[PDB]
Amino acid sequence: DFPNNKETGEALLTPVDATASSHDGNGPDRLIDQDLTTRWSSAGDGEWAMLDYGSVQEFDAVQASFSKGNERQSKFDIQVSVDGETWTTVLENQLSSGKAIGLERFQFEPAVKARYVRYVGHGNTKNGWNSVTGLAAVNCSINACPASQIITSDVVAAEAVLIAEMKAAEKARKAARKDLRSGNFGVAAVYPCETSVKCDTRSALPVPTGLPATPVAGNAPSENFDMTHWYLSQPFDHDKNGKPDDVSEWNLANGYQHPEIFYTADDGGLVFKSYVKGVRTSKNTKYARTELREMMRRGDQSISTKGVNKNNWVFSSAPEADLEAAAGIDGVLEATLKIDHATTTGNANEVGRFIIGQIHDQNDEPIRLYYRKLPNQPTGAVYFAHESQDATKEDFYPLVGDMTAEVGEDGIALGEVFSYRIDVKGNTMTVTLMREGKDDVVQVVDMSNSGYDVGGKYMYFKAGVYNQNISGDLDDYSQATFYQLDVSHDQYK
Ligand code: NA
């Protein structure tokens, strides 16, 4: 019904903003990126995505491309507004073709004035998902409105060629990732105990008493920080055993550094870099880490790494025999760090996410503390998870934002120094996030019914960068620089 459409015309306007009532990670920016492989996805009738053109224009159609658009028909209305507050329906009870993944036009008359155009979804012919790979408002008196956006047999036939191309590109992308879980990369740095130091692994290391109150340039990590109570897991595998290369307390405490992934910065800070690629700690782990694991045996390798023993602590809520057997009771981990870079590649639900502190027992995590920055947010979020009742329950707690990381300017920027404290006393865990010039944020977790005090559970702290992105490019990475890493425990009486 539109005799007057043109094959070519003026370029479409760039919206100044794309927003949405809700989404699952896959946000409304993905409507305007001229990319069929990305989508805005949102579940529920009446959820919307809105384009702001920044000023009032005349429009008479929209063009839209649909996720899985050759498998089901999407149901929707289109509304417009001049003021952004009240909405006029211009297209009602629309149904996509069900036959194509490309752009399809939905056109009306007369043209209307609008600054804002929104897609209101009513799910699809199979389920409740509103999933749209492209949306733009069009004025067919000035822009291209091509016949190829009315879905006929020839358009569907051309798409078979496009889909085959896209499938081939997908297989090529997969082939490029073949070395994902491999540790074959990185220079080799010296292990002190194998080269320059005779390490007495029958004995605990000396307690380092020199340490400067703030880290100094030119010091090894062990001269700026107490490294005697950690081992480091590195995501490369130079001894070819299929596992990370671990750096024992005796090597760490004697000045170990690796110039790519664990080293003293020009300003003294301790840098941890974690690529997406790397050998992982086990089959059941999806992600690489460059991360320290607490070792209260402090280099006395006669003491086993695992167990309620003199290498691990327990909560003071644990049975008496555990309190006495453990190396200490309760615990505080306090760190100061900045985030240098967060992954910017990968799927919408993983990109920019990693973990900067943990408590673990043999199986589960009393806490995992996350930072996450999205590529299109100017700052990042910090939040945590608490697993409970043998990990059959998991609860997320915000500190500065949450796992969605939609913090705008209100989060923690790259390069911004901040501190955290994780303080366990019995079945209470207090997590504090401290920032310069701002009030502390404090979350108290009641672990009463969490099951960490039953008996037999041993604990250790972790700190560093544990990636939570596997889908990103293999060389993409997250990096943090620490200025404080202080661990404390109480003693059994
Ligand atoms: Na897209």
Short mmCIF file of C-alpha atoms and ligand atoms in Angstrom, two decimals:
data_model
loop_
_atom_site.label_atom_id
_atom_site.label_comp_id
_atom_site.label_asym_id
_atom_site.label_seq_id
_atom_site.Cartn_x
_atom_site.Cartn_y
_atom_site.Cartn_z
CA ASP A 1 0.00 0.00 0.00
CA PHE A 2 2.89 2.42 -0.43
CA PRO A 3 3.49 3.22 -4.07
CA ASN A 4 5.93 6.03 -3.31
CA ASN A 5 8.82 4.32 -1.51
CA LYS A 6 12.39 4.91 -2.85
CA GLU A 7 15.25 2.44 -3.16
CA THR A 8 17.80 4.94 -1.85
CA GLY A 9 17.75 8.22 0.06
CA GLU A 10 19.20 9.97 3.03
CA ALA A 11 21.04 8.14 5.81
CA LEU A 12 18.89 7.33 8.82
CA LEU A 13 19.40 9.40 11.95
CA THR A 14 21.57 8.13 14.78
CA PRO A 15 19.53 8.05 17.91
CA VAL A 16 21.21 9.89 20.77
CA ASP A 17 20.04 7.23 23.19
CA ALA A 18 18.41 3.82 23.25
CA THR A 19 16.82 2.73 26.49
CA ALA A 20 14.49 0.00 27.71
CA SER A 21 12.04 -0.89 30.43
CA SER A 22 14.12 -4.05 31.12
CA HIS A 23 16.49 -6.55 29.49
CA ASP A 24 18.36 -9.77 30.35
CA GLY A 25 21.86 -8.32 29.80
CA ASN A 26 21.31 -7.96 26.13
CA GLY A 27 20.56 -4.20 26.16
CA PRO A 28 18.90 -1.73 23.84
CA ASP A 29 22.21 -0.43 22.46
CA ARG A 30 22.13 -3.65 20.42
CA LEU A 31 19.15 -2.35 18.47
CA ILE A 32 21.14 0.36 16.80
CA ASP A 33 24.51 -1.28 16.07
CA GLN A 34 23.69 -2.44 12.49
CA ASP A 35 24.55 -6.00 13.62
CA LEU A 36 22.26 -9.04 13.23
CA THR A 37 24.34 -11.01 15.70
CA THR A 38 23.44 -8.83 18.66
CA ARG A 39 19.99 -8.25 20.21
CA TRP A 40 17.95 -6.50 22.81
CA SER A 41 16.12 -9.20 24.78
CA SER A 42 13.43 -8.71 27.37
CA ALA A 43 10.76 -11.07 28.77
CA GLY A 44 7.17 -10.01 29.44
CA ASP A 45 4.25 -8.31 27.77
CA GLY A 46 4.44 -4.57 27.65
CA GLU A 47 8.23 -4.32 28.00
CA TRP A 48 9.61 -1.63 25.68
CA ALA A 49 12.68 -0.35 23.94
CA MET A 50 12.85 3.36 23.06
CA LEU A 51 14.89 5.39 20.60
CA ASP A 52 15.53 9.08 21.36
CA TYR A 53 16.28 11.02 18.19
CA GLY A 54 17.17 14.11 20.31
CA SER A 55 14.74 16.43 18.59
CA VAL A 56 11.36 16.28 16.86
CA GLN A 57 11.31 14.61 13.41
CA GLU A 58 8.68 13.32 11.03
CA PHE A 59 8.33 9.52 10.70
CA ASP A 60 5.99 7.14 8.88
CA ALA A 61 7.46 3.68 9.47
CA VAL A 62 9.87 1.58 11.39
CA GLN A 63 12.26 -1.10 10.14
CA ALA A 64 13.05 -3.95 12.48
CA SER A 65 15.01 -7.21 12.36
CA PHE A 66 14.04 -10.05 14.74
CA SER A 67 16.13 -12.58 16.69
CA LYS A 68 15.24 -16.08 15.36
CA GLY A 69 12.98 -14.18 12.98
CA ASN A 70 12.73 -17.12 10.51
CA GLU A 71 11.34 -19.40 13.31
CA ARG A 72 8.55 -17.45 14.98
CA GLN A 73 6.65 -14.17 14.65
CA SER A 74 7.24 -11.33 17.10
CA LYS A 75 4.15 -9.40 18.41
CA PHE A 76 4.39 -5.66 19.10
CA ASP A 77 3.07 -2.13 18.97
CA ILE A 78 4.96 1.01 18.02
CA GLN A 79 4.34 4.26 19.99
CA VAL A 80 5.71 7.78 19.52
CA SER A 81 6.05 10.88 21.67
CA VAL A 82 7.13 14.48 21.24
CA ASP A 83 7.57 15.16 25.02
CA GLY A 84 8.75 11.72 26.16
CA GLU A 85 6.00 11.43 28.73
CA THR A 86 2.80 10.67 26.87
CA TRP A 87 2.63 8.06 24.07
CA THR A 88 0.59 7.70 20.90
CA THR A 89 0.13 4.35 19.23
CA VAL A 90 0.97 4.48 15.49
CA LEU A 91 1.11 0.72 14.79
CA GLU A 92 -0.92 -1.76 16.78
CA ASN A 93 -0.94 -5.59 16.92
CA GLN A 94 1.93 -5.95 14.49
CA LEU A 95 3.32 -9.36 13.64
CA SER A 96 6.73 -9.95 12.14
CA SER A 97 7.00 -12.21 9.07
CA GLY A 98 8.28 -15.32 10.85
CA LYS A 99 10.32 -15.93 7.68
CA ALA A 100 13.42 -13.76 7.86
CA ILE A 101 16.25 -12.50 10.04
CA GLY A 102 16.76 -9.28 8.06
CA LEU A 103 15.06 -5.91 8.28
CA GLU A 104 11.34 -5.80 7.76
CA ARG A 105 9.31 -2.53 7.41
CA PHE A 106 6.13 -1.66 9.25
CA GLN A 107 4.64 1.48 7.72
CA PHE A 108 1.66 3.72 8.41
CA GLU A 109 0.04 6.96 7.16
CA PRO A 110 -0.11 9.84 7.73
CA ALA A 111 3.38 10.60 9.00
CA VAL A 112 3.63 11.79 12.60
CA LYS A 113 5.91 14.14 14.48
CA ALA A 114 8.04 12.46 17.16
CA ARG A 115 11.27 12.83 19.06
CA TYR A 116 10.94 9.39 20.75
CA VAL A 117 9.90 6.05 19.17
CA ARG A 118 9.33 2.95 21.16
CA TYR A 119 8.76 -0.72 20.45
CA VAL A 120 6.27 -2.25 22.93
CA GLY A 121 6.68 -6.06 22.88
CA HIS A 122 3.96 -8.66 23.43
CA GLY A 123 6.32 -11.65 23.12
CA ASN A 124 6.26 -13.97 20.11
CA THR A 125 4.16 -16.85 18.68
CA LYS A 126 6.15 -19.39 20.71
CA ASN A 127 6.98 -17.75 24.03
CA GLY A 128 7.20 -14.48 25.94
CA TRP A 129 10.58 -13.17 24.60
CA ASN A 130 10.93 -9.78 22.96
CA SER A 131 14.15 -10.27 21.09
CA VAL A 132 15.05 -7.74 18.41
CA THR A 133 18.37 -7.38 16.56
CA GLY A 134 17.71 -3.98 14.86
CA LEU A 135 15.18 -1.12 15.05
CA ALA A 136 15.05 2.30 13.38
CA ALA A 137 12.45 4.89 12.68
CA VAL A 138 12.11 5.82 9.03
CA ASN A 139 10.67 8.60 6.98
CA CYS A 140 9.97 7.17 3.60
CA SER A 141 9.66 10.59 2.01
CA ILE A 142 13.38 11.18 2.69
CA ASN A 143 15.01 7.84 3.53
CA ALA A 144 15.44 4.59 1.67
CA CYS A 145 12.41 2.25 2.07
CA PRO A 146 13.53 -0.72 -0.13
CA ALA A 147 11.23 -3.45 -1.48
CA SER A 148 13.68 -5.93 0.18
CA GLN A 149 12.08 -5.06 3.55
CA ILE A 150 8.77 -6.62 2.54
CA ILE A 151 9.43 -10.28 3.15
CA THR A 152 8.71 -12.15 -0.09
CA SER A 153 10.18 -15.40 -1.53
CA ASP A 154 13.12 -13.67 -3.15
CA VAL A 155 14.10 -11.91 0.08
CA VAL A 156 13.92 -15.29 1.89
CA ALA A 157 16.02 -16.86 -0.88
CA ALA A 158 18.72 -14.17 -0.55
CA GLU A 159 18.78 -14.69 3.16
CA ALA A 160 19.64 -18.38 2.71
CA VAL A 161 22.95 -17.15 1.32
CA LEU A 162 23.46 -14.63 4.14
CA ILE A 163 22.65 -17.27 6.77
CA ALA A 164 25.17 -19.72 5.25
CA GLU A 165 27.81 -16.94 5.32
CA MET A 166 27.02 -16.19 8.96
CA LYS A 167 27.27 -19.92 9.87
CA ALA A 168 30.67 -20.19 8.17
CA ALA A 169 31.89 -17.08 10.07
CA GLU A 170 30.66 -18.64 13.35
CA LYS A 171 32.67 -21.80 12.69
CA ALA A 172 35.72 -19.72 11.83
CA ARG A 173 35.38 -17.76 15.08
CA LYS A 174 35.19 -21.05 17.03
CA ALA A 175 38.28 -22.45 15.21
CA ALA A 176 40.22 -19.31 16.28
CA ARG A 177 39.51 -20.14 19.98
CA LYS A 178 40.98 -23.64 19.98
CA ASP A 179 43.71 -22.71 22.49
CA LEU A 180 41.31 -21.23 25.09
CA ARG A 181 42.02 -23.69 27.95
CA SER A 182 45.66 -24.08 27.19
CA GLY A 183 48.51 -22.64 29.24
CA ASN A 184 51.06 -22.45 26.40
CA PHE A 185 52.06 -18.73 26.53
CA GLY A 186 54.04 -16.20 28.70
CA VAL A 187 57.73 -15.71 29.32
CA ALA A 188 59.46 -17.86 31.89
CA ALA A 189 60.56 -15.97 35.06
CA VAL A 190 62.95 -17.29 37.69
CA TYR A 191 61.69 -19.26 40.74
CA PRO A 192 63.99 -18.07 43.61
CA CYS A 193 64.11 -21.44 45.31
CA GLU A 194 65.41 -23.16 42.12
CA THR A 195 68.02 -20.52 41.35
CA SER A 196 69.17 -18.03 44.00
CA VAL A 197 67.81 -19.01 47.44
CA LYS A 198 68.09 -22.19 49.43
CA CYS A 199 64.51 -22.50 50.64
CA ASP A 200 63.97 -24.47 53.87
CA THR A 201 60.62 -26.07 53.08
CA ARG A 202 60.74 -28.00 56.35
CA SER A 203 60.29 -24.69 58.20
CA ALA A 204 57.93 -21.75 58.35
CA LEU A 205 59.26 -18.60 56.71
CA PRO A 206 60.44 -15.63 58.81
CA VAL A 207 57.72 -13.10 59.50
CA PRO A 208 58.55 -10.10 57.33
CA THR A 209 59.00 -7.15 59.67
CA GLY A 210 60.51 -4.61 57.27
CA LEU A 211 57.41 -3.80 55.22
CA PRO A 212 56.84 -0.17 54.15
CA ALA A 213 53.54 1.38 55.18
CA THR A 214 52.73 1.95 51.53
CA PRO A 215 54.30 0.03 48.63
CA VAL A 216 57.52 1.34 47.09
CA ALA A 217 58.65 1.29 43.47
CA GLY A 218 61.55 -1.12 42.82
CA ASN A 219 60.57 -3.49 45.70
CA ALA A 220 59.60 -7.07 44.90
CA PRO A 221 56.04 -7.97 45.89
CA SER A 222 57.41 -9.72 48.99
CA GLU A 223 59.20 -6.52 50.05
CA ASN A 224 55.98 -4.52 49.82
CA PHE A 225 53.53 -7.13 51.14
CA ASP A 226 53.53 -10.17 53.36
CA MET A 227 53.76 -12.96 50.80
CA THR A 228 54.65 -15.65 53.32
CA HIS A 229 51.03 -16.73 53.73
CA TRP A 230 49.97 -17.13 50.08
CA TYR A 231 50.70 -19.26 47.07
CA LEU A 232 50.01 -17.84 43.56
CA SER A 233 48.11 -19.73 40.84
CA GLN A 234 49.31 -18.60 37.35
CA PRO A 235 47.20 -19.37 34.20
CA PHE A 236 50.10 -20.70 32.13
CA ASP A 237 51.45 -24.27 32.14
CA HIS A 238 55.18 -24.27 31.44
CA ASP A 239 55.84 -27.70 32.92
CA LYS A 240 53.20 -29.23 30.66
CA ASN A 241 51.13 -30.97 33.35
CA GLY A 242 47.72 -29.58 32.37
CA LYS A 243 47.44 -27.45 35.48
CA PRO A 244 48.29 -23.84 36.43
CA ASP A 245 51.86 -23.17 37.48
CA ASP A 246 51.74 -22.48 41.20
CA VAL A 247 54.30 -20.33 43.06
CA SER A 248 54.82 -21.65 46.63
CA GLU A 249 55.08 -19.45 49.72
CA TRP A 250 58.88 -19.96 49.82
CA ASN A 251 59.19 -18.68 46.23
CA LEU A 252 56.72 -15.82 46.62
CA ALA A 253 58.29 -14.66 49.88
CA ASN A 254 61.70 -14.59 48.21
CA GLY A 255 60.83 -12.01 45.54
CA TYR A 256 59.06 -13.94 42.78
CA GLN A 257 57.62 -11.68 40.04
CA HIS A 258 56.33 -12.41 36.56
CA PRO A 259 56.60 -9.31 34.34
CA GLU A 260 53.36 -9.96 32.37
CA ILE A 261 51.01 -11.05 35.12
CA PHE A 262 52.26 -10.50 38.72
CA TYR A 263 54.66 -7.68 39.28
CA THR A 264 55.47 -4.47 41.06
CA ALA A 265 54.22 -1.41 39.09
CA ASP A 266 56.20 1.75 38.52
CA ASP A 267 54.45 3.20 41.56
CA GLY A 268 54.97 0.18 43.84
CA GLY A 269 51.49 -1.34 43.43
CA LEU A 270 51.14 -5.13 42.89
CA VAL A 271 49.69 -5.83 39.49
CA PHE A 272 47.60 -8.95 38.74
CA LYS A 273 46.65 -9.50 35.07
CA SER A 274 44.16 -12.23 34.07
CA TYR A 275 43.54 -13.04 30.35
CA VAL A 276 40.42 -14.85 29.17
CA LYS A 277 42.82 -17.60 27.93
CA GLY A 278 44.72 -19.89 30.24
CA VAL A 279 44.96 -23.28 31.88
CA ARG A 280 42.22 -23.60 34.50
CA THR A 281 42.50 -25.03 38.04
CA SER A 282 40.15 -27.91 37.30
CA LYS A 283 37.64 -29.39 34.87
CA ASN A 284 34.75 -27.76 36.78
CA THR A 285 36.10 -24.24 36.60
CA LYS A 286 35.13 -22.22 33.44
CA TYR A 287 37.58 -19.37 34.03
CA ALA A 288 41.27 -18.50 34.31
CA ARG A 289 42.76 -16.89 37.37
CA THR A 290 45.83 -15.01 38.53
CA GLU A 291 45.03 -15.35 42.22
CA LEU A 292 46.53 -15.99 45.65
CA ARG A 293 45.33 -18.77 47.96
CA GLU A 294 45.93 -18.31 51.70
CA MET A 295 48.48 -20.68 53.29
CA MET A 296 48.63 -20.34 57.09
CA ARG A 297 51.45 -23.00 57.18
CA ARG A 298 53.60 -20.09 55.91
CA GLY A 299 56.07 -22.25 53.95
CA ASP A 300 56.23 -25.26 56.33
CA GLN A 301 55.46 -27.81 53.59
CA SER A 302 55.15 -30.65 56.11
CA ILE A 303 51.64 -29.27 56.68
CA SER A 304 48.98 -30.30 54.07
CA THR A 305 47.32 -27.62 51.97
CA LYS A 306 43.85 -29.03 52.65
CA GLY A 307 42.13 -29.77 55.94
CA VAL A 308 41.11 -28.42 59.35
CA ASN A 309 44.83 -28.19 60.16
CA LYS A 310 47.69 -25.73 60.64
CA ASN A 311 47.33 -24.34 57.09
CA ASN A 312 43.66 -23.16 57.34
CA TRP A 313 41.27 -21.30 59.65
CA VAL A 314 37.72 -21.96 60.74
CA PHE A 315 34.81 -19.75 61.91
CA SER A 316 34.66 -19.31 65.72
CA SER A 317 31.12 -20.81 65.48
CA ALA A 318 32.72 -24.21 64.59
CA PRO A 319 33.01 -27.19 67.01
CA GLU A 320 35.65 -26.98 69.74
CA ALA A 321 37.90 -29.63 68.18
CA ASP A 322 38.02 -27.54 64.94
CA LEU A 323 38.82 -24.35 66.89
CA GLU A 324 41.77 -26.09 68.46
CA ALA A 325 43.04 -27.99 65.36
CA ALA A 326 42.93 -25.00 62.94
CA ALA A 327 45.76 -22.46 62.45
CA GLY A 328 43.40 -19.64 63.55
CA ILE A 329 39.80 -18.72 64.12
CA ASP A 330 37.69 -16.12 62.33
CA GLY A 331 39.41 -13.82 59.83
CA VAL A 332 39.76 -10.36 58.26
CA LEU A 333 40.95 -9.68 54.70
CA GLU A 334 41.55 -6.02 53.95
CA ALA A 335 42.71 -4.76 50.51
CA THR A 336 43.23 -1.50 48.67
CA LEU A 337 43.30 -1.66 44.91
CA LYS A 338 42.39 0.03 41.63
CA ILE A 339 41.04 -1.65 38.47
CA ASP A 340 43.36 -0.91 35.52
CA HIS A 341 41.24 -2.59 32.82
CA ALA A 342 38.17 -4.87 32.61
CA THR A 343 37.48 -7.23 29.63
CA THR A 344 35.54 -5.37 26.92
CA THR A 345 34.81 -8.43 24.71
CA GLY A 346 32.52 -11.43 25.10
CA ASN A 347 28.83 -12.05 25.66
CA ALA A 348 26.60 -9.42 27.24
CA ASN A 349 26.27 -11.40 30.46
CA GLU A 350 30.03 -11.93 31.11
CA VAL A 351 31.84 -8.94 29.72
CA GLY A 352 33.79 -6.89 32.22
CA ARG A 353 33.25 -9.23 35.22
CA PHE A 354 35.85 -10.72 37.61
CA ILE A 355 36.46 -11.58 41.20
CA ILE A 356 38.87 -9.68 43.50
CA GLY A 357 38.51 -11.45 46.92
CA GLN A 358 37.02 -14.75 48.20
CA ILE A 359 36.58 -16.99 51.16
CA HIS A 360 36.53 -20.68 50.24
CA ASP A 361 35.99 -23.91 52.11
CA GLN A 362 36.75 -27.30 50.53
CA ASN A 363 33.74 -26.99 48.18
CA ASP A 364 31.84 -23.73 48.43
CA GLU A 365 32.29 -19.99 48.91
CA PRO A 366 31.21 -18.01 51.97
CA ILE A 367 31.99 -14.96 49.71
CA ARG A 368 33.00 -14.10 46.22
CA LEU A 369 33.60 -10.35 45.82
CA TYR A 370 33.17 -9.06 42.26
CA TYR A 371 34.03 -6.00 40.23
CA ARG A 372 32.20 -5.52 36.93
CA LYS A 373 32.49 -2.66 34.37
CA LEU A 374 30.44 -2.74 31.15
CA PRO A 375 32.06 -1.34 27.96
CA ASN A 376 29.38 1.36 27.66
CA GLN A 377 29.24 2.49 31.33
CA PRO A 378 31.76 5.04 32.60
CA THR A 379 32.27 3.34 35.93
CA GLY A 380 31.88 -0.18 37.37
CA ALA A 381 30.04 -2.01 40.14
CA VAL A 382 31.23 -3.94 43.21
CA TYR A 383 28.99 -6.58 44.76
CA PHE A 384 29.23 -10.05 46.28
CA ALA A 385 27.76 -13.49 46.49
CA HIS A 386 27.28 -15.66 49.56
CA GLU A 387 26.78 -19.43 48.94
CA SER A 388 25.03 -21.34 51.72
CA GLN A 389 23.80 -24.81 52.80
CA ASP A 390 26.35 -26.72 50.78
CA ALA A 391 25.88 -24.28 47.86
CA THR A 392 22.21 -25.14 47.34
CA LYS A 393 21.51 -21.44 48.05
CA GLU A 394 23.30 -18.37 46.67
CA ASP A 395 22.49 -14.76 47.50
CA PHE A 396 23.87 -11.58 45.78
CA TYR A 397 24.41 -8.41 47.81
CA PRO A 398 25.02 -4.99 46.27
CA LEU A 399 27.83 -2.69 47.49
CA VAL A 400 28.23 -0.08 44.74
CA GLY A 401 25.66 -1.34 42.27
CA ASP A 402 24.93 -4.98 41.38
CA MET A 403 25.63 -7.76 38.92
CA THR A 404 23.99 -5.82 36.08
CA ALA A 405 26.63 -3.10 36.53
CA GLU A 406 24.37 -0.34 35.22
CA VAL A 407 25.93 2.22 37.53
CA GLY A 408 26.33 5.21 35.16
CA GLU A 409 28.73 7.75 36.73
CA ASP A 410 27.96 6.53 40.23
CA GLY A 411 30.24 3.51 40.46
CA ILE A 412 33.96 3.00 40.72
CA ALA A 413 36.01 4.17 37.75
CA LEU A 414 39.01 2.51 36.14
CA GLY A 415 42.04 3.84 38.07
CA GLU A 416 40.02 4.78 41.13
CA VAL A 417 41.58 3.42 44.31
CA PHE A 418 39.10 1.81 46.73
CA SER A 419 39.30 -0.59 49.65
CA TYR A 420 37.39 -3.63 50.89
CA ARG A 421 37.20 -5.47 54.17
CA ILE A 422 35.75 -8.93 54.67
CA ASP A 423 35.41 -9.69 58.35
CA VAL A 424 34.14 -12.98 59.65
CA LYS A 425 33.28 -13.28 63.36
CA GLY A 426 31.53 -16.58 64.08
CA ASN A 427 28.37 -16.80 61.94
CA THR A 428 28.44 -13.08 61.08
CA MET A 429 30.26 -11.74 58.04
CA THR A 430 30.60 -7.96 57.63
CA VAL A 431 31.69 -6.69 54.20
CA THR A 432 32.74 -3.03 53.96
CA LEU A 433 33.52 -1.12 50.78
CA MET A 434 35.51 2.06 51.45
CA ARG A 435 36.06 4.92 48.99
CA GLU A 436 37.92 8.21 49.31
CA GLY A 437 35.58 11.08 50.20
CA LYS A 438 32.51 8.85 50.56
CA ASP A 439 30.75 7.03 53.36
CA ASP A 440 31.57 3.31 53.89
CA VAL A 441 29.09 0.88 52.40
CA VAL A 442 28.49 -1.99 54.83
CA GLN A 443 26.62 -5.29 54.32
CA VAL A 444 26.10 -7.64 57.24
CA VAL A 445 25.53 -11.27 56.26
CA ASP A 446 23.86 -13.51 58.85
CA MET A 447 25.40 -16.94 58.26
CA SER A 448 23.37 -18.60 61.10
CA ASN A 449 21.83 -21.13 58.86
CA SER A 450 24.58 -21.26 56.34
CA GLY A 451 26.16 -24.48 57.46
CA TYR A 452 29.84 -23.37 57.65
CA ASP A 453 29.96 -24.17 61.43
CA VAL A 454 28.81 -27.84 61.18
CA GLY A 455 32.34 -29.21 61.67
CA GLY A 456 35.04 -30.32 59.26
CA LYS A 457 35.00 -27.24 57.02
CA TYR A 458 38.31 -25.41 56.58
CA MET A 459 38.67 -21.91 55.20
CA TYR A 460 41.11 -19.84 53.29
CA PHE A 461 41.06 -16.36 51.80
CA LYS A 462 41.80 -15.64 48.11
CA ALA A 463 42.70 -12.30 46.43
CA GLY A 464 43.89 -11.23 43.04
CA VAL A 465 41.92 -11.38 39.72
CA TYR A 466 39.81 -14.45 39.01
CA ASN A 467 38.26 -13.92 35.58
CA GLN A 468 34.51 -14.45 35.15
CA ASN A 469 34.63 -14.06 31.38
CA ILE A 470 35.19 -17.07 29.14
CA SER A 471 33.44 -15.84 25.98
CA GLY A 472 35.73 -12.85 25.44
CA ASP A 473 38.68 -12.76 23.06
CA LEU A 474 41.53 -15.02 24.31
CA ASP A 475 43.94 -12.07 24.73
CA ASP A 476 41.40 -9.79 26.35
CA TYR A 477 42.02 -9.38 30.07
CA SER A 478 41.17 -7.74 33.37
CA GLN A 479 43.88 -6.23 35.50
CA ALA A 480 44.01 -4.80 39.00
CA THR A 481 46.74 -3.15 41.04
CA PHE A 482 46.77 -3.68 44.86
CA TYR A 483 48.24 -1.27 47.42
CA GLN A 484 47.21 -3.20 50.57
CA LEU A 485 46.68 -6.93 51.22
CA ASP A 486 46.36 -7.50 55.02
CA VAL A 487 45.18 -10.78 56.57
CA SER A 488 44.35 -11.31 60.24
CA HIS A 489 42.98 -14.16 62.37
CA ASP A 490 42.25 -14.76 66.04
CA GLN A 491 43.75 -17.46 68.25
CA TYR A 492 42.11 -20.31 70.09
CA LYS A 493 42.16 -20.03 73.88
NA NA B 1 22.01 -5.78 16.83
#
